[PDB]
Design a protein around this ligand. Structure first.
Ligand SMILES: [Mg+2]
Ligand SMILES: [Mg+2]
Ligand SMILES: [Mg+2]
Ligand SMILES: [Mg+2]
Ligand SMILES: [Mg+2]
Ligand SMILES: [Mg+2]
Ligand SMILES: [Mg+2]
Ligand SMILES: [Mg+2]
Ligand SMILES: [Mg+2]
Ligand SMILES: [Mg+2]
Ligand SMILES: [Mg+2]
Ligand SMILES: [Mg+2]
Ligand SMILES: [Mg+2]
Ligand SMILES: [Mg+2]
Ligand SMILES: [Zn+2]
Lengths: 85, 71, 59, 85, 184, 141
RNA sequence: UAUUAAUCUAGAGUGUGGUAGGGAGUUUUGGAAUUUCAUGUGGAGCGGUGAAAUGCGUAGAUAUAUGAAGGAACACCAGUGGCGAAGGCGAAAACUUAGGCCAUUACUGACGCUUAGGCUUGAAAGUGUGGGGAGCAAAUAGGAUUAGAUACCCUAGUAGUCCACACCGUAAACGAUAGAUACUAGCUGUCGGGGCGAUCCCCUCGGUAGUGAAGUUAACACAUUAAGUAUCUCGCCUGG
RNA sequence: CUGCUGAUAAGGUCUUCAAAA
């Protein structure tokens, strides 16, 4: 499993902030990487594929919201995460 | 006649964890005279403890601690 | 399914062997003809329901 | 008009003059029935029996055949209706 | 993680099988914490496996990373001296979080005390235990529950606007319809 | 006033109140509560003025962040309500706009029609008197 | 109502703390039973049926005891049950991994519901390549029954059923009931978390069942897990 | 306690009526 504490402490905009959109999408990207690794390894686990698709869609919706509101933070988040491509 | 003394022993003990090398003689009571897992009506445990006991007893039977078909 | 005669009497041995043979014959006849998985599940549930209702009315 | 001694299991709509009361106690039912009969007997003019009376004349006994048990039992004679195929 | 190995070794001679277990321990278990070992003993196992009737049982209570199992698992079958072996990861057993939970442990100890007291009263030495109250129901409900019962979060609201409040109170349902009998 | 149960409400403010009122009427229930919105507050004010409810009462949390409105129905002595039915017109999606010329008359004037023209919600008769119309929320008779 | 500029937590998520599961994939392991083969004892039948006959058998069958090989499925536990979105999931273990329930003085601050088009999965049968083949058995052969039997019964029996990789994308794929949200009597069980602390039982929050009034229905019936009071969105119907 | 057991040309009456006693 991933070090959620480390990911949150890296992605926090300030202290005690553990549920912002930026920390949520950073956690989502980490889980996306882990699930892509697992799915490429296995290739016949379809529940994991469903979970991966759900997480991808949730990340996309969160990024759409963060682009609609406070777009400068969206540019910041995208250039730190390099998730677009 | 019959009896109403059927209660989950592990519920009263509050054992909360089953290990096959801590109450080995306890599981032999649950096992049938022909080495089968007795149902709830005879065994007396609740569903959670019955499931735990069944898994532990099957693990022991794999480990060759109690037979399969004979006494 | 060993039952000891105990050499004290014989009718007792047959009285227990009748049961042991009955619950043995149940599974012996169950594993005789091939039914689908769903039909086998239906038969198991039907037997369980019959036993449950009999015990409810006898208790 | 219909009056009745409702006992917590009756439909209040059907009865006009509801009398919240017991129906299982042979002393309570006797007391209330005799009270209604006392109303009738006073209207048709004989001496009363229980109404407008002191304790020494209201007192009653408990029929034969610690405290009295107004407990409803014998739920075991309510099996599932004959079904199954 | 926290693992638990149950090793089953051929019953030739106790010191030699102790050496066998020590070698099997020191060979595999790449990354490991302290490896405490027990000795269940020589037992006449139920069914004959590997054409043997007696076997030494050991239990290993080591703990370590997920890679600690592969070499041991692939070497146990190769070793002719080991009949079987079971790596039971206790972190996945049927109830482990409850076992680590501290409050449940103390509660279990209290249950132990009370149940032992009840069983002693039932198996009184020679005087006759009239109640024989073990499987039956208990006495009146627990005053401890009756007192320490939880209180829901009753969120308090402050009145701002009101209109039409008079509190008439019309709690006379099923009132009699007929009033007085009369003649034409 | 203190409460114990959580309070939820539908996203549609007119039909939420209408469903609450209709269910309370059918089940003979007297007091009901819901989340407070200003449209609902005004509509309940006009219902109380027209005499279809006993009282409506708004309340606010201790932190002044949440408001809930609780109202009671007006039952007679024999326990039969004054409301006979409710039907919502301007549902979400299809909003109903009618000028003064087509302002409806509910049940030949026995019931009332709730119209929120320009000065908050407004009864059909007073809307006719003011010669101006607008959004038509619900029919209550 | 829509647009814009902002605030708030009650919808929805995230974090911490409790926690139940046959949820999924990959790799190893185990025991009953059938079959075949090997080795002993034994001597006329075994098998099969409504009744028999094909068939197997003095080249020693059926039976009995021991051993070996290989394949497929995992008794009892097993339920007036659990998990998943559906198909579906039940011998043991490890590794990887998905979702859910309860309590939150924490955080973001409407980020939500539905979803044409698109993508993903989808019982069994079927296809292609390579493996595997114990049992069962479409097609096929024979013996019966029959007026006939290309069927029901029996004896054999190939594909298939099994694994890996690619397709097919249909089912009475059913709760014959799309999803989400708010409200509306009660009674009896059962499963999980939490509160008390022997079990049992009590309370709270949820899952899954039975009975049942208002209410709905053409009737059967549904009935807080609605087919009730209403809203939103999608799909679908218009006589045989 | 389960053998076997297949078929039956076409079209058709029959309610006149309650006004009422
Ligand atoms: Mg079939
Ligand atoms: Mg609004
Ligand atoms: Mg053999
Ligand atoms: Mg297939
Ligand atoms: Mg032929
Ligand atoms: Mg026939
Ligand atoms: Mg055959
Ligand atoms: Mg072919
Ligand atoms: Mg179809
Ligand atoms: Mg199905
Ligand atoms: Mg019903
Ligand atoms: Mg047509
Ligand atoms: Mg014949
Ligand atoms: Mg003909
Ligand atoms: Zn228990």
């Amino acid at each position: 499993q991933i070090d959620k504490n480390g990911i949150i402490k890296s992605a926090q905009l300030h202290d005690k902030d553990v549920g912002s959109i930026q920390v949520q999408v950073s956690l989502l990207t980490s889980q996306i990487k882990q699930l892509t690794d697992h799915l490429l390894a296995n290739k016949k686990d379809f529940i994991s594929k469903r979970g991966l698709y759900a997480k991808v869609s949730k990340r996309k919706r969160l990024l759409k919201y963060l682009k609609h509101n406070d777009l400068e933070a969206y540019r910041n988040l995208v250039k730190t995460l390099n998730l677009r491509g | 006649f019959k009896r109403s003394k059927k209660y989950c022993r592990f519920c009263a003990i509050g054992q909360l964890r089953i290990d096959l090398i801590d109450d080995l003689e306890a599981l032999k009571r649950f096992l049938s005279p022909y080495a089968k897992i007795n149902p709830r009506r005879i065994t007396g445990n609740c569903q959670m403890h019955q499931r735990h006991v069944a898994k532990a007893l099957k693990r022991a039977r794999y480990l060759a601690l109690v037979p399969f078909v004979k006494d | 399914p060993k039952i000891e005669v105990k050499n004290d009497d014989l009718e007792l041995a047959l009285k227990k062997f009748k049961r042991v043979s009955l619950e043995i014959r149940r599974l012996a006849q169950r594993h005789e003809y091939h039914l689908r998985k769903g039909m086998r599940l239906r038969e198991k549930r039907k037997i369980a329901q019959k036993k449950r209702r009999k015990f409810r009315n006898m208790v | 008009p219909v009056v009745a001694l409702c006992n917590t299991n009756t439909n209040p709509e059907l009865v006009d003059f509801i009398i919240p009361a017991n129906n299982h106690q042979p002393q309570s039912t006797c007391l209330l029935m005799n009270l209604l009969a006392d109303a009738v007997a006073e209207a048709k003019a004989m001496p009363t029996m229980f109404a407008y009376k002191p304790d020494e004349e209201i007192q009653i006994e408990i029929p034969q055949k610690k405290q009295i048990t107004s407990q409803r039992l014998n739920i075991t004679r309510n099996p599932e209706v004959l079904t199954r195929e | 993680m926290q693992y638990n190995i149950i090793l089953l070794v051929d019953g030739s001679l106790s010191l030699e099988q102790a050496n066998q277990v020590n070698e099997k321990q020191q060979q595999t278990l790449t990354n490991v914490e302290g490896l405490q070992t027990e000795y269940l003993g020589l037992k006449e196992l139920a069914y004959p496996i590997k054409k043997q009737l007696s076997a030494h049982y050991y239990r290993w209570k080591f703990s370590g990373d997920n890679q600690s199992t592969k070499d041991f698992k692939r070497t146990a079958n190769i070793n002719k001296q080991v009949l079987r072996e079971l790596i039971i990861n206790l972190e996945r057993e049927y109830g482990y979080l409850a076992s680590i939970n501290p409050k449940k442990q103390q509660l279990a100890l209290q249950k132990r005390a009370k149940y032992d007291e009840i069983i002693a009263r039932e198996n009184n030495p020679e005087n006759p235990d009239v109640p024989v109250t073990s499987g039956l129901a208990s006495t009146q409900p627990r005053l401890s529950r009756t007192e320490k019962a939880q209180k829901p979060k009753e969120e308090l609201w402050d009145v701002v606007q009101k209109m039409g409040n008079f509190d008439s109170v019309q709690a006379n349902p099923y009132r009699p319809r007929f009033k007085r009998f009369n003649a034409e | 006033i203190t409460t114990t149960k959580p309070i939820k409400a539908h996203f549609d403010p007119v039909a939420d109140l209408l469903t609450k009122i209709n269910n309370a009427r059918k089940a003979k229930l007297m007091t009901v509560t819901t989340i407070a919105s200003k449209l609902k507050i005004a509509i309940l004010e006009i219902l109380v003025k027209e005499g279809y409810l006993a009282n409506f009462q708004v309340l606010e949390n201790k932190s002044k962040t949440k408001r809930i409105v609780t109202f009671n129905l007006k039952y007679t002595q024999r326990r039969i309500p004054s409301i006979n039915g409710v039907k919502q017109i301007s549902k979400p999606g299809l909003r109903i706009y009618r000028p003064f010329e087509k302002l409806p008359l509910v049940l030949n004037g026995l019931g009332i029609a709730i119209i929120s023209t320009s000065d908050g919600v407004m009864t059909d008769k007073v809307a006719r008197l003011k010669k101006i119309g607008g959004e038509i929320l619900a029919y209550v008779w």
